[PDB]
Structure 1
Amino acid sequence: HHHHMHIHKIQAREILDSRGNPTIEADVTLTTGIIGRASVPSGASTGSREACELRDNDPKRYAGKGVQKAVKHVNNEINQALQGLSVEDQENLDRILCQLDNTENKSHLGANAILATSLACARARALSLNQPLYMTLNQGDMMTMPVPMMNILNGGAHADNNVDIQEFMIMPIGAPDFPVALQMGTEIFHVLKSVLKKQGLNTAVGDEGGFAPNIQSNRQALDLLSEAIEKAGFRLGEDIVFALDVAASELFNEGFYHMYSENQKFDSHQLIEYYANLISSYPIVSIEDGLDEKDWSGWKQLTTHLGNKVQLVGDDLFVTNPKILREGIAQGIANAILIKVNQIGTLSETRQAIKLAYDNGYRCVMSHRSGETEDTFIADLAVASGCGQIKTGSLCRTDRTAKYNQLLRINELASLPYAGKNIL
């Protein structure tokens, strides 16, 4: 009977994210007793057009970062708005949530309250169907185990070192399947720890589990990773390639991009040239947010000049937002989008952005935030969407490894190809 998908109750609670800041978790209980549960991540380098992350701003509670207001919105308005409705229709529930909030940026109820509800409903649906989450999430795309881009040296907003570039990532693109890809990246990660330790560089980790040394230059960071790849026995280019998240909106000030670690200040043109030179020296296949979220003329130039040679990922540029991605597609900027559910607030709108990217030749990279939880939703969504690439952290900290472990579990019975080099 299909009334078994009807919602009995929705509730939320405050939990801690992986940085120690509160975030929201929602439980959706159906009339059969089944409970779908999901929690919401939180970024540090957040684009200016991300949907509203509703916080309490009480200085006497968690330094103003409580989320009891968002919890209260789930317990009250959202619960009573959705009770008796079916979780079988994800689009209908997300539509009701957006209309209940009735603001462009989800600032009445909070994008975190809406997303917690949206994802918990998706899990309640999957439990009702008695199928793994990734199966219930697929909308016809050919599923693959994704290639991970693994952020093993952290900088920028994620660490207190002098590193300007936010993320230095390795991608085990030459691996034959996902378990071996994880093994390769893990082995490189541990060799990198030894390489750093021998040079007296910091091996404590930043927010995403990558080491947080001070570096002499971005090139030194890439040299250190190259050294670790070689000492682990893998081949640059053939086995492992590089991806970067510059998070350049964090470096843009007063009309210039500031590479403080290198005492350099670049206009847009000079930073494009800077990237072209890095690409000619290292196998960098992907650059995320190479330019500022408002530098649309720069992004167009970057895409024309280097887009044939490298993947260019809009993160803050697009904020997982179909309206913004549509404008970017029309203007010809970037060729990939970083998919962050909590940048937009619902599964359904995330799916819109994915469809708009696929239909127009853009790749999708499924992504964590730097503030994670134990929730592994993005592992199932990466597989289900067939996007072929995931960005979910270094190889330490369970906020990251829990996603890698969920991919290992999915790989057991999914009988799916590894995206591998097809992502190029």
Structure 2
Amino acid sequence: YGTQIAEITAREILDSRGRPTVEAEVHLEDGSVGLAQVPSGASTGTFEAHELRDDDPSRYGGKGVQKAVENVSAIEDALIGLSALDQEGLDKAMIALDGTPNKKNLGANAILAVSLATAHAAATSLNLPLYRYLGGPLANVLPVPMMNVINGGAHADNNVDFQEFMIMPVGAPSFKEALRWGAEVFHALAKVLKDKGLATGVGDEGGFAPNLGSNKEALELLLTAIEAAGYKPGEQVALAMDVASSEFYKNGLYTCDGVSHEPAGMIGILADLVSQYPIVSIEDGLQEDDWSNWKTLTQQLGSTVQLVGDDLFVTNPDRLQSGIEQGVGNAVLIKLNQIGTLTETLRTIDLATRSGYRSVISHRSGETEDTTIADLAVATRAGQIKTGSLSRSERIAKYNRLLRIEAALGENALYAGAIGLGPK
């Protein structure tokens, strides 16, 4: 009785970009309160669960979420009296109430808010930390963070073709040290940008978008920053890229370094970068429907470098299943709000895990003060998290959460980077 849902309330709040998003509050009969906020970023297309916007041009430029918030009222009517411990029944009941494949009726933002809020309330009722509620007694692995430092493509005003350049402190003895290494490299990068003429204003993720001339200049700048902070590139702090190749792809051709490339040219660019630079991960190296060439890329590089599908997989079990069947990729970016329930997100992580793919638990461009993905990462032993740069607390809050989880785990805490659960 004590864990029965008594109240579900939703509210329009703002995300880290000053845009409306949804929060939900779940109260149980025993007085346990769960509170969760929903992130938001730019949709990739057809398989991403629908973020419901009001499209009222007189409120927040058409980006109000009053309809999503009101839809939580119909979710409250369906869910009152069910046990908060039955996460799966809860999620299945909202999926059935919505009645659409992409959650376009209730809104993925309405549904995910209640899904996460309920989980927080159930963890609190059992007096379990959320990582332990979600993952059981082996939820002890702190992820290697993918830490944004330089942006390009459509995330900048520069001549860098690739979207994001990241550092990964793979060689750190603990998450606490991993975070310090990332932070020292970020501040050494800031000093190197300022010492040159370059802008230090930060984008959505808390990193820099200086006017650089090429991808190579980006990578050489990270290596300069790592060296300046006193770390070995590769063994201690390695590099990773989000290519977001779909952004410079037109009719079988990839436009990169000023030249149009055939798929084999794009693959050769990625191969040359890998053989020169300590790059351990490449996300969306080829476009989201170029499966035959992803096959080639995976056969060629997949042994030595992590190949992450984001747009490729859209946190979708069917798309990940096809990828597994075709030897396409070896990792998947996990975005809760791309699929819209905690349950379906756990099903997708499980499919990836038991097929030998790495799960990288991901933020969106629009984040909140919510830290669920820190707990989700540790609960599923994912071993990797992508949650932005070393500035802006919608990003730092997840690192702070992971410090708290690592301290509570005591002698049981493992760092993915030291036990072979990091990038591969």
* Band of TM-score, shorter chain: over 0.9
Q: 1:296 — aligned with what?
A: 291
1:133–1:380 CA contact under 8 A, matched in 2 = yes
Q: Return the match for 1:56 from 54, 57, 60.
A: 54
Q: Return the match for 1:14 from 8, 12, 21.
A: 12
Query: Shift of the alpha carbon at 1:30?
Result: 1.2
1:183-239 CA-to-partner distances (Å, cap 9, x unmatched) read: 000000000001011110111111101111111100000000100000111111121
Query: Shift of the alpha carbon at 1:301?
Result: 1.5
Root mean square deviation, CA, Å: 1.3
- What is the CA–CA distance in structure 1 between the aligned matches of 2:407 and 2:139, rounded to whole Å? 17
Q: Return the match for 2:203 from 203, 206, 224.
A: 206
The one-letter amino acid of 2:19's match is: N
Q: Which moved more, 1:152-161 or 1:358-367?
A: 152-161
Does 2:28 match 1:33?
no
Query: Shift of the alpha carbon at 1:45?
Result: 5.8
Structure 1 56/159 Cα, relative in aligned 2: closer, same or farther at 3 Å?
farther
- What is the CA–CA distance in structure 2 between the aligned matches of 1:111 and 1:42, rounded to whole Å? 11
Query: Shift of the alpha carbon at 1:164?
Result: 2.8
Q: Return the match for 1:195 from 181, 192, 196.
A: 192
- What is the CA–CA distance in structure 1 between the aligned matches of 2:183 and 2:387, rounded to whole Å? 13
Q: 1:90 — aligned with what?
A: 87
Q: Which runs of 5+ in 2 are unaligned?
A: none
Query: Shift of the alpha carbon at 1:292?
Result: 1.0
Aligned residue runs from structure 1 range 321-360, under 5 A: 321-360=316-355
Pairs aligned (count):
419
Q: 2:385 — aligned with what?
A: 390
1:85-108 CA-to-partner distances (Å, cap 9, x unmatched) read: 111111111111111111111111
The one-letter amino acid of 1:171's match is: M
Does 2:311 match 1:316?
yes
Structure 1 377/19 Cα, relative in aligned 2: closer, same or farther at 3 Å?
same
1:158–1:208 CA contact under 8 A, matched in 2 = no
Secondary structure of the residue aligned to 1:258 is strand
Q: Return the match for 1:223 from 198, 213, 220.
A: 220
The percentage of counterpart residues that share the same residue type is 61
Secondary structure of the residue aligned to 1:149 is strand
Q: 1:374 — aligned with what?
A: 369
Query: Shift of the alpha carbon at 1:20?
Result: 1.3
1:385-410 CA-to-partner distances (Å, cap 9, x unmatched) read: 10111111100011100000000111
Q: Which runs of 5+ in 1 are unaligned?
A: none
1:6-54 CA-to-partner distances (Å, cap 9, x unmatched) read: 0111111111111111110011111222210101111136344211111
1:143–1:385 CA contact under 8 A, matched in 2 = no
2:161–2:214 CA contact under 8 A, matched in 1 = no
Q: Which moved more, 1:130-139 or 1:278-287?
A: 130-139
Structure 1 399/111 Cα, relative in aligned 2: closer, same or farther at 3 Å?
same
Does 2:121 match 1:124?
yes
1:365–1:387 CA contact under 8 A, matched in 2 = yes
Query: Shift of the alpha carbon at 1:157?
Result: 3.8
2:139–2:378 CA contact under 8 A, matched in 1 = no
- What is the CA–CA distance in structure 2 between the aligned matches of 1:47 and 1:338, rounded to whole Å? 15
The one-letter amino acid of 2:165's match is: F
Q: 2:151 — aligned with what?
A: 154
The one-letter amino acid of 2:169's match is: P
- What is the CA–CA distance in structure 1 between the aligned matches of 2:190 and 2:36, rounded to whole Å? 33
Q: Which moved more, 1:213-222 or 1:53-62?
A: 53-62
